[PDB]
């Protein structure tokens, strides 16, 4: 009602890579592609809001 | 200045660093023609984003609120 | 020789890296500029002092 | 990374109190002139 308005101009994604040595990077990739070394997660709240 | 007759450049000079605003201090200009103050000006210490155009006057929003 | 401008008070110098085998010490003195002729060239028309 | 223009409208006001003549008494009127019909 008070006419406070917003206007997005542009958006660019940024990311940062650890300059891992290529041999170690490849070894780490081969490790994490294993079936058993999968990555798990859980939401901190863990809940089902109603 | 009583006609200092010394060699105009006796000290060692250092290669000009290649980036913006260090070659010389002259009244510059924007991309679209706005004047730019010299490199060693005080007013260039901080940053002035100076995005001028706000969003269009939301009179349509006022009418929508009324309706 | 090193130039010392008028009313001055520090003169710094340097020699770039070299080997210093068999060095045997420094020795320095100060001369009036208009009293030192420009040796090394055939004839200096700016040596107006006798 | 997001950049753009944001307008807060007339109602944005981060300072409590006023900005002009803050010391002045709140009832004191500025030097003014006005009309006043009267017959004597």
UniProtKB/Swiss-Prot annotation, chain B:
- Compartments (UniProt record): Virion; Host nucleus
What intrachain disulfides are recorded? none
- Which factors induce or repress this protein, as stated in its UniProt record? Expressed in the intermediate phase of the viral replicative cycle.
Q: Where are the transmembrane segments?
A: none
Record remark: domains: Three N-terminal domains of hexon-interlacing protein form triskelions between hexon capsomers.
The annotated subunit structure for this chain is: Homotrimer. Interacts with hexon protein; this interaction tethers the hexons together. Self-interacts with adjacent proteins. Interacts with kinesin light chain KLC1; this interaction leads to capsid disruption at the nuclear pore complex during virus entry into host cell.
Miscellaneous note of the record: This protein is only encoded by mastadenoviruses, and may therefore play a role in mammals tropism.
> What exactly does this protein do?
Structural component of the virion that acts as a cement protein on the capsid exterior and forms triskelion structures consisting of three molecules that stabilize three hexon trimers at the center of each icosahedral facet and fixes the peripentonal hexons. Dispensable for assembly. During virus entry, recruits the anterograde motor kinesin-1 to the capsid docked at the nuclear pore complex thereby subjecting the docked capsid to a pulling force.
The Swiss-Prot or TrEMBL record describes its family as follows: Belongs to the adenoviridae hexon-interlacing protein family.
Could you tell me what this protein is called? Hexon-interlacing protein
Q: Which organism is it from?
A: Human adenovirus C serotype 5 (HAdV-5)
From Swiss-Prot, chain C:
Q: What induces it?
A: Expressed in the late phase of the viral replicative cycle.
User: What pairs make up the disulfide bonds?
Assistant: none
Which subcellular locations apply to this protein? Virion; Host nucleus
Give the record's subunit note: Homotrimer. Interacts with the capsid vertex protein; this interaction binds the peripentonal hexons to the neighboring penton base. Interacts with the hexon-linking protein; this interaction tethers the hexons surrounding the penton to those situated in the central plate of the facet. Interacts with the hexon-interlacing protein; this interaction lashes the hexons together. Interacts with host dyneins DYNC1LI1 and DYNC1I2; this interaction might be involved in intracellular microtubule-dependent transport of incoming viral capsid.
Which family does the UniProt entry place this protein in? Answer: Belongs to the adenoviridae hexon protein family.
Q: What else is known?
A: All late proteins expressed from the major late promoter are produced by alternative splicing and alternative polyadenylation of the same gene giving rise to non-overlapping ORFs. A leader sequence is present in the N-terminus of all these mRNAs and is recognized by the viral shutoff protein to provide expression although conventional translation via ribosome scanning from the cap has been shut off in the host cell.
This chain's function reads: Major capsid protein that self-associates to form 240 hexon trimers, each in the shape of a hexagon, building most of the pseudo T=25 capsid. Assembled into trimeric units with the help of the chaperone shutoff protein. Transported by pre-protein VI to the nucleus where it associates with other structural proteins to form an empty capsid. Might be involved, through its interaction with host dyneins, in the intracellular microtubule-dependent transport of incoming viral capsid to the nucleus.
Q: What is this protein called?
A: Hexon protein
Species name for this entry?
Human adenovirus C serotype 5
């Amino acid at each position: 009602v008070d006419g406070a308005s917003i206007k997005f101009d542009s958006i660019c994604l940024y990311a940062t890579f650890f300059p891992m040595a290529h041999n170690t990077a490849s070894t780490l990739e081969a490790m994490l592609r294993n079936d058993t070394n999968d990555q798990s997660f859980n939401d901190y709240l863990s809940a089902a809001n109603m | 200045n009583s006609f200092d007759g010394s060699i105009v450049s006796s000290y060692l000079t250092t290669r000009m660093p290649p980036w913006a605003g260090v070659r010389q201090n002259v009244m510059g200009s924007s991309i679209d023609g706005r004047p730019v103050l010299p490199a060693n000006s005080t007013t260039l210490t901080y940053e002035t984003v100076s995005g001028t155009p706000l969003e269009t006057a939301a009179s349509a929003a006022a009418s929508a609120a009324a309706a | 020789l090193y130039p010392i401008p008028a009313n001055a008070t520090n003169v710094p110098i340097s020699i770039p890296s070299r080997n210093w085998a068999a060095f045997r010490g420094w020795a320095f003195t100060r001369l009036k500029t208009k009293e030192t002729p420009s040796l090394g060239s055939g004839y200096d028309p700016y040596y107006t002092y006798s | 990374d997001i950049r753009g223009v944001l307008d807060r409208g007339p109602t944005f006001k981060p300072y409590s109190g006023t900005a002009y003549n803050a010391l002045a008494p709140k009832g004191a009127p500025n030097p003014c002139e006005w009309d006043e019909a009267a017959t004597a």
